[PDB]
PDB file of C-alpha atoms and ligand atoms in Angstrom:
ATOM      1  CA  UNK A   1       0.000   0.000   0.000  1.00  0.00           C
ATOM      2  CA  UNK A   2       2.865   2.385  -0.049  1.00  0.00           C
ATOM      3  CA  UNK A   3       3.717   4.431  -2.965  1.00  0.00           C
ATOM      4  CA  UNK A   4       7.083   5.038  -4.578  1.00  0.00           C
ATOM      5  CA  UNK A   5       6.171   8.719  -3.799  1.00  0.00           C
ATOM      6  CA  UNK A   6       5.850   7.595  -0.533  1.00  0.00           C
ATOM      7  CA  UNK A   7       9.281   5.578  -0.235  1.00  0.00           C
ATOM      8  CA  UNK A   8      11.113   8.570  -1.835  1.00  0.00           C
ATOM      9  CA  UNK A   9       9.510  11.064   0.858  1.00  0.00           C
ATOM     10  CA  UNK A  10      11.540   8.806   3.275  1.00  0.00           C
ATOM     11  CA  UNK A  11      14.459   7.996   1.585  1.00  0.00           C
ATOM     12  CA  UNK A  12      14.892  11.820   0.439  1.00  0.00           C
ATOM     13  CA  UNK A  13      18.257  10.785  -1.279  1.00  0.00           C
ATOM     14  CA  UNK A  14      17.076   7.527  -2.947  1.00  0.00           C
ATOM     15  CA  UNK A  15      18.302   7.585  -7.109  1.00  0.00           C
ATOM     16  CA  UNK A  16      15.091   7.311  -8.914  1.00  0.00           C
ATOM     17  CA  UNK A  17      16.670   3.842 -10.325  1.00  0.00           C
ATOM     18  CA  UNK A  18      16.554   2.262  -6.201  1.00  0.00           C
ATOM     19  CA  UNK A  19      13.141   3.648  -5.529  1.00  0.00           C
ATOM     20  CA  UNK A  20      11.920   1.828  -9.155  1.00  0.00           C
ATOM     21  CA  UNK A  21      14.468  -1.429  -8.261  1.00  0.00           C
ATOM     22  CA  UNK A  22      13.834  -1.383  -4.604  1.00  0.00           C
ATOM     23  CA  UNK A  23       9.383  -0.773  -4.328  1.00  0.00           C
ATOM     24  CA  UNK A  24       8.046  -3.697  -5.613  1.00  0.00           C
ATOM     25  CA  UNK A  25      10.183  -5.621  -3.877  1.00  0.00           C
ATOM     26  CA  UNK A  26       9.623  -4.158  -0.747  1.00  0.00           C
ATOM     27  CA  UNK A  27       5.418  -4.054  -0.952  1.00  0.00           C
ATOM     28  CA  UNK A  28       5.998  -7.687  -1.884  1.00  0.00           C
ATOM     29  CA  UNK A  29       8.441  -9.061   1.310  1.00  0.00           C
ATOM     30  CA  UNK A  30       6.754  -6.706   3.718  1.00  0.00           C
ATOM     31  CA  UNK A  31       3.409  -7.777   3.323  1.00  0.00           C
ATOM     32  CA  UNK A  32       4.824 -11.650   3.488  1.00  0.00           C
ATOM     33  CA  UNK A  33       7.205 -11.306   6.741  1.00  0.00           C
ATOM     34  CA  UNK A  34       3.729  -9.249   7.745  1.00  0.00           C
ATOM     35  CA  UNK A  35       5.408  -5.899   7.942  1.00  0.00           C
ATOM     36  CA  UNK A  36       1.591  -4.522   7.683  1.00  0.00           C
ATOM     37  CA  UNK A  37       0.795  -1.551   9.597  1.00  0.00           C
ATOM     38  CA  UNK A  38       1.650   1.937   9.606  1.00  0.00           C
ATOM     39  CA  UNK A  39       3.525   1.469  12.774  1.00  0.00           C
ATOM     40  CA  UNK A  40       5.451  -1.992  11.563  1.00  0.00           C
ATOM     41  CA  UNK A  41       5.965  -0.468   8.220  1.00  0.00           C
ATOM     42  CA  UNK A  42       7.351   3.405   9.228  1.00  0.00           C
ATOM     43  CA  UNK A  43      10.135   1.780  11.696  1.00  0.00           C
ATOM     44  CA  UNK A  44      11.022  -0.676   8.999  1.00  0.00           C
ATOM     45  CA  UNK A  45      11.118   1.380   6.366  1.00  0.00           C
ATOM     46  CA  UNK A  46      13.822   4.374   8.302  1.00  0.00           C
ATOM     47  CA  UNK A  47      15.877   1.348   9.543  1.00  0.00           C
ATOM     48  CA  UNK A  48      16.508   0.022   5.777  1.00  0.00           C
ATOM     49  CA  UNK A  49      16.885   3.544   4.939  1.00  0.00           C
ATOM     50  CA  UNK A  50      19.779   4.329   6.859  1.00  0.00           C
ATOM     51  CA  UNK A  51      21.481   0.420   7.041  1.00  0.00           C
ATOM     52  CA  UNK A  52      21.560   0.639   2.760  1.00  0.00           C
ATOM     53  CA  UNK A  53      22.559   4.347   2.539  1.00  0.00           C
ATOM     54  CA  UNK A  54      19.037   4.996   1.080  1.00  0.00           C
ATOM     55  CA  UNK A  55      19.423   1.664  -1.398  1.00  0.00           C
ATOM     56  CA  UNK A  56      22.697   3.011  -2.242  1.00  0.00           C
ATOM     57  CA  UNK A  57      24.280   0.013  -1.129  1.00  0.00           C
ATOM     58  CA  UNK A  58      23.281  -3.750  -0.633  1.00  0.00           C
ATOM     59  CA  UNK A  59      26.998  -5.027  -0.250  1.00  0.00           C
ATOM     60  CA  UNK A  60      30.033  -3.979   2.458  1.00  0.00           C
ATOM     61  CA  UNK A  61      32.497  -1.632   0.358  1.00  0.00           C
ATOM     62  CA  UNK A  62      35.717  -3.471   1.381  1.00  0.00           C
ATOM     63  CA  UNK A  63      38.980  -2.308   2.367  1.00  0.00           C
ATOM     64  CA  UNK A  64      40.128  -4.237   3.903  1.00  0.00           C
ATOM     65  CA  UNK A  65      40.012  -1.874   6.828  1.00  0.00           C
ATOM     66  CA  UNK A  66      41.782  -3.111  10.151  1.00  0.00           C
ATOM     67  CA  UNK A  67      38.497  -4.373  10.713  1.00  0.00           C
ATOM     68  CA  UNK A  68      37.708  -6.086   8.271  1.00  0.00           C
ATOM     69  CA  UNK A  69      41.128  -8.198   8.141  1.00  0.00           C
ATOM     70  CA  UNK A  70      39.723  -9.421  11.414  1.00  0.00           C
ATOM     71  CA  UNK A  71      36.733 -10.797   9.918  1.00  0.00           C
ATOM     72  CA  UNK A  72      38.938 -14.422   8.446  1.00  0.00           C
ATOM     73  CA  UNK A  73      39.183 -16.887  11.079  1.00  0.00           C
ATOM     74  CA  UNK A  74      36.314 -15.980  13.468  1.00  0.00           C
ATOM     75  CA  UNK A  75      34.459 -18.652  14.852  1.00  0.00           C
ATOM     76  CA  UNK A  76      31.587 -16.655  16.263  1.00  0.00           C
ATOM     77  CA  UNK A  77      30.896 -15.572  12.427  1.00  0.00           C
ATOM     78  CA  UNK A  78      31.722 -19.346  11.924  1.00  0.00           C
ATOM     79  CA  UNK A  79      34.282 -18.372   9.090  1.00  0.00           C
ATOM     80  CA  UNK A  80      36.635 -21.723   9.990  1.00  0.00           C
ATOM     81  CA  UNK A  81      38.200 -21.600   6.423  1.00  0.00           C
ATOM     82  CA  UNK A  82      40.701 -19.478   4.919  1.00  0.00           C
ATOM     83  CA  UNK A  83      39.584 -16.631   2.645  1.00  0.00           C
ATOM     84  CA  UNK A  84      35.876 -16.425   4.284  1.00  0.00           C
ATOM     85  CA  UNK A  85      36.232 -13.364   6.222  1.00  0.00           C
ATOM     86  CA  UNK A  86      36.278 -11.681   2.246  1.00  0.00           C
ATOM     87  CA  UNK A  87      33.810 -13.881   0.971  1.00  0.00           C
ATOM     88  CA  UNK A  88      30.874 -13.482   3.513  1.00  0.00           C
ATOM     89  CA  UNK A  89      31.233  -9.827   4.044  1.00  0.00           C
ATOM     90  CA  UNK A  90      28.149  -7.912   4.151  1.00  0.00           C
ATOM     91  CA  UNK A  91      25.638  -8.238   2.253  1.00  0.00           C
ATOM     92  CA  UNK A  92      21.697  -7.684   2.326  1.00  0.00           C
ATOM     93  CA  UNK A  93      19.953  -4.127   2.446  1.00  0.00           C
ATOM     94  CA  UNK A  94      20.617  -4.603   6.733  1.00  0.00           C
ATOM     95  CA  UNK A  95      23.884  -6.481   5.884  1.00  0.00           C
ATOM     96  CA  UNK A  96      24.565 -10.013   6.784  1.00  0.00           C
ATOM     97  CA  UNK A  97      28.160 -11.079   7.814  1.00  0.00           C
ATOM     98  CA  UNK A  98      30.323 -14.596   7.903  1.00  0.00           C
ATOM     99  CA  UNK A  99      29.812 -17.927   6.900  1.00  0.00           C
ATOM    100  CA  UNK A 100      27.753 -18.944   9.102  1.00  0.00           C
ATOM    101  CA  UNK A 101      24.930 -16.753   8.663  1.00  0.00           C
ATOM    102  CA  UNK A 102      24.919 -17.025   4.920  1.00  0.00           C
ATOM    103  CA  UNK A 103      23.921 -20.162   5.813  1.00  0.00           C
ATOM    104  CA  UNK A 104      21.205 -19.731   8.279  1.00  0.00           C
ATOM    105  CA  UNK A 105      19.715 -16.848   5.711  1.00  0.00           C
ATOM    106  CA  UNK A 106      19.980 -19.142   2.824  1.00  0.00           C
ATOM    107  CA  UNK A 107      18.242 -22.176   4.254  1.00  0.00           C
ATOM    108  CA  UNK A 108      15.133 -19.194   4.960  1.00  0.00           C
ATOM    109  CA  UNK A 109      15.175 -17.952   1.980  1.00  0.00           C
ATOM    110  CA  UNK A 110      15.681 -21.268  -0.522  1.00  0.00           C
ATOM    111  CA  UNK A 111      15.727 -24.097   1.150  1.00  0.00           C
ATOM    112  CA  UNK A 112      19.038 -25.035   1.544  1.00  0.00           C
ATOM    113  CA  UNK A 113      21.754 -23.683   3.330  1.00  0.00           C
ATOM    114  CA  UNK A 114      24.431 -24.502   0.733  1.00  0.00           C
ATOM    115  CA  UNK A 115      22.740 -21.624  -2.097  1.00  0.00           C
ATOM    116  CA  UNK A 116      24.460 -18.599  -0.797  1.00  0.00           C
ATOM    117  CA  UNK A 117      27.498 -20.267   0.640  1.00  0.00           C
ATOM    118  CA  UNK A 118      27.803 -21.551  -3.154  1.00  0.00           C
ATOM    119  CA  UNK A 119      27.141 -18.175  -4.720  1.00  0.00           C
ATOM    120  CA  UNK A 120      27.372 -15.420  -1.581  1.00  0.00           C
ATOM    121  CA  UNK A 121      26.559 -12.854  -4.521  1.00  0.00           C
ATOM    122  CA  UNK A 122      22.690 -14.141  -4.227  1.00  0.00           C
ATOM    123  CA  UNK A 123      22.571 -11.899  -0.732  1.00  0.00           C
ATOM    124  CA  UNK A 124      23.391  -8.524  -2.983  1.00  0.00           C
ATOM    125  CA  UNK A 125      20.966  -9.371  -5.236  1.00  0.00           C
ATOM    126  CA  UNK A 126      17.297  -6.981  -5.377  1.00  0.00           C
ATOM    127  CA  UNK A 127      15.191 -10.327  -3.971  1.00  0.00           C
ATOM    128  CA  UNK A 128      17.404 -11.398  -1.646  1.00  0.00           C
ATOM    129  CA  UNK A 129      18.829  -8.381   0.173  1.00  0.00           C
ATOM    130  CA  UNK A 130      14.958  -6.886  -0.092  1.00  0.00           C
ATOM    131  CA  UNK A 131      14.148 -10.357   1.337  1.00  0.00           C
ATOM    132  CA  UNK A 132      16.644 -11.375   3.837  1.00  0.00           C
ATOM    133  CA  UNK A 133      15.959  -7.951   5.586  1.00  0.00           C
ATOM    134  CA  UNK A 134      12.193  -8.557   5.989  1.00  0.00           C
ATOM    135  CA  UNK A 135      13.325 -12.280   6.953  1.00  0.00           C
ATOM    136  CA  UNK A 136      15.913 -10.635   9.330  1.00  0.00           C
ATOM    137  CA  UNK A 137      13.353  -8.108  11.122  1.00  0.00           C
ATOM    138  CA  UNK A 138      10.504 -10.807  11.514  1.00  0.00           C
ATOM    139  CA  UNK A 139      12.842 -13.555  12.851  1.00  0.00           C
ATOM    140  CA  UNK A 140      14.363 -11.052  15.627  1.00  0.00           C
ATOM    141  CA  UNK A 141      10.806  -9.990  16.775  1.00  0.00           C
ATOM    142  CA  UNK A 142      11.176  -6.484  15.835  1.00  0.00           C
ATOM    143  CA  UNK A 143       7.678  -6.633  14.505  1.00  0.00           C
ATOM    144  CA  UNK A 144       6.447  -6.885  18.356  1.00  0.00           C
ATOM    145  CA  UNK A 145       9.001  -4.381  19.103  1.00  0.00           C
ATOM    146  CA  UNK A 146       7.916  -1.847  17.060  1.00  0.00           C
ATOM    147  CA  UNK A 147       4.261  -2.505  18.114  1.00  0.00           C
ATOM    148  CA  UNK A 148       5.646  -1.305  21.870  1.00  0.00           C
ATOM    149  CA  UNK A 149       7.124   1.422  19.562  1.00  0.00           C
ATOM    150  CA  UNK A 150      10.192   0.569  20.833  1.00  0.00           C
ATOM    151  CA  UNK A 151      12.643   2.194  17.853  1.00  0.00           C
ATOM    152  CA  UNK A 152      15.883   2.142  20.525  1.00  0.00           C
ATOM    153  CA  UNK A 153      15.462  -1.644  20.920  1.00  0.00           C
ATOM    154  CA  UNK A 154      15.108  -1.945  17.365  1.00  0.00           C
ATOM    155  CA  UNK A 155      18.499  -0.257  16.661  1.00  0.00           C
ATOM    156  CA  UNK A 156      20.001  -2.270  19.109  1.00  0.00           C
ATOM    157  CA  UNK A 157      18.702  -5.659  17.703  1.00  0.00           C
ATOM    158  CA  UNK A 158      19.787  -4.358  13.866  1.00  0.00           C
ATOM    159  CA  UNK A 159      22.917  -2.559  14.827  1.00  0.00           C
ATOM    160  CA  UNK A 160      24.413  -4.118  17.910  1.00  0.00           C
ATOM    161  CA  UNK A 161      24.353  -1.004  19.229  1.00  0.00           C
ATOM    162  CA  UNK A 162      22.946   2.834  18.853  1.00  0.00           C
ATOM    163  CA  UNK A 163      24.978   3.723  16.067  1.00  0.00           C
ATOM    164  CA  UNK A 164      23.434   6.194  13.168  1.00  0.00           C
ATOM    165  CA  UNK A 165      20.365   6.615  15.846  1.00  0.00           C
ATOM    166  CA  UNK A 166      20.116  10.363  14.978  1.00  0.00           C
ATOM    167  CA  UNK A 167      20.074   9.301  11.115  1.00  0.00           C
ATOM    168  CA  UNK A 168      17.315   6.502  11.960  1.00  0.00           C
ATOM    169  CA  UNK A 169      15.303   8.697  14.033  1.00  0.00           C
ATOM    170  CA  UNK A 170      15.175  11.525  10.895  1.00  0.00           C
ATOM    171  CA  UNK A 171      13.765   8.807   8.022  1.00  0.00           C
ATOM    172  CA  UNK A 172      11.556   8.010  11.206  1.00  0.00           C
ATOM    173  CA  UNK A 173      10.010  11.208  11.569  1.00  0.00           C
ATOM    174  CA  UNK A 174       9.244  11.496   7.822  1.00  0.00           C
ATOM    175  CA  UNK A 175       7.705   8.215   7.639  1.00  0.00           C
ATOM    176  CA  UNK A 176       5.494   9.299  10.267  1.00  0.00           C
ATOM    177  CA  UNK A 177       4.482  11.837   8.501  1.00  0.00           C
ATOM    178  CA  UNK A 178       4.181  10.271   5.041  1.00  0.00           C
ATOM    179  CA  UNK A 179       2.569   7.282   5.818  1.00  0.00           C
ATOM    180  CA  UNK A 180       0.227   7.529   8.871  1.00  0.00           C
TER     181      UNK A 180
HETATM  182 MG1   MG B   1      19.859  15.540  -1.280  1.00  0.00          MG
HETATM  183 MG1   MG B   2      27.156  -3.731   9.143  1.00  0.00          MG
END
């Protein structure tokens, strides 16, 4: 039920190309992870807004920063084998990170864990990182959260943290105003 006008009024810095890639696909995975109400729909909306840089970006641009050199050989991302930490960087529109949840996202999203750990380029695709977000946000119970309205809790859940919060709470606002 939302418009491309709509998503643009949010994502003020959208190209026209994202908003026409990135709406269908959005009405379509929302309404199936039951991102359905104004409420549910507004917080999900100015989270993916600021995680993708406005659908600027559905893959990690890699350095490899200090940071990201630290991504090979960690077990809690379950990258046990060499040259991982590259190949499962982020990826999604709320990027997904390391081996190991490539594969929990791929058995979601088609059946078998093996399809992105074969091809990790599936995750930057329009369907997947459109779908692996709304997968991401209904398997983490942010759909009850943001029926408490509970946007911090939200961040913390996406992010790890509060990082960006100013950035999430502006797309926020306009939602709010845009779509209720
Ligand atoms: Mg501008
Ligand atoms: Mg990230």
């Amino acid at each position: 039920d939302i418009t491309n006008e709509q998503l643009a009024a949010i994502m003020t810095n959208a190209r026209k190309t994202g908003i026409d890639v990135f709406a269908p696909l959005l009405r379509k995975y929302m309404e199936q992870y039951e991102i359905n109400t104004p409420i549910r729909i507004s917080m999900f909306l100015s989270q993916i807004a600021h995680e993708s840089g406005e659908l600027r970006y559905t893959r990690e641009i890699w350095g490899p920063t200090d940071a990201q050199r630290r991504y090979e050989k960690r077990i809690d991302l379950g990258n046990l084998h060499v040259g991982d930490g590259k190949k499962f960087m982020g990826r999604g529109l709320i990027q997904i990170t390391g081996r190991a949840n490539y594969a929990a996202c791929s058995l979601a999203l088609t059946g078998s864990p093996d399809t992105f750990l074969d091809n990790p380029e599936l995750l930057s695709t329009p369907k997947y990182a459109t779908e692996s977000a709304c997968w991401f946000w209904y398997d983490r119970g942010l759909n009850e959260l943001a029926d408490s309205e509970d946007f911090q809790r939200i961040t913390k859940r996406i992010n790890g943290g509060l990082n960006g919060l100013e950035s999430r709470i502006k797309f926020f606002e306009r939602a709010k105003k845009n779509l209720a």
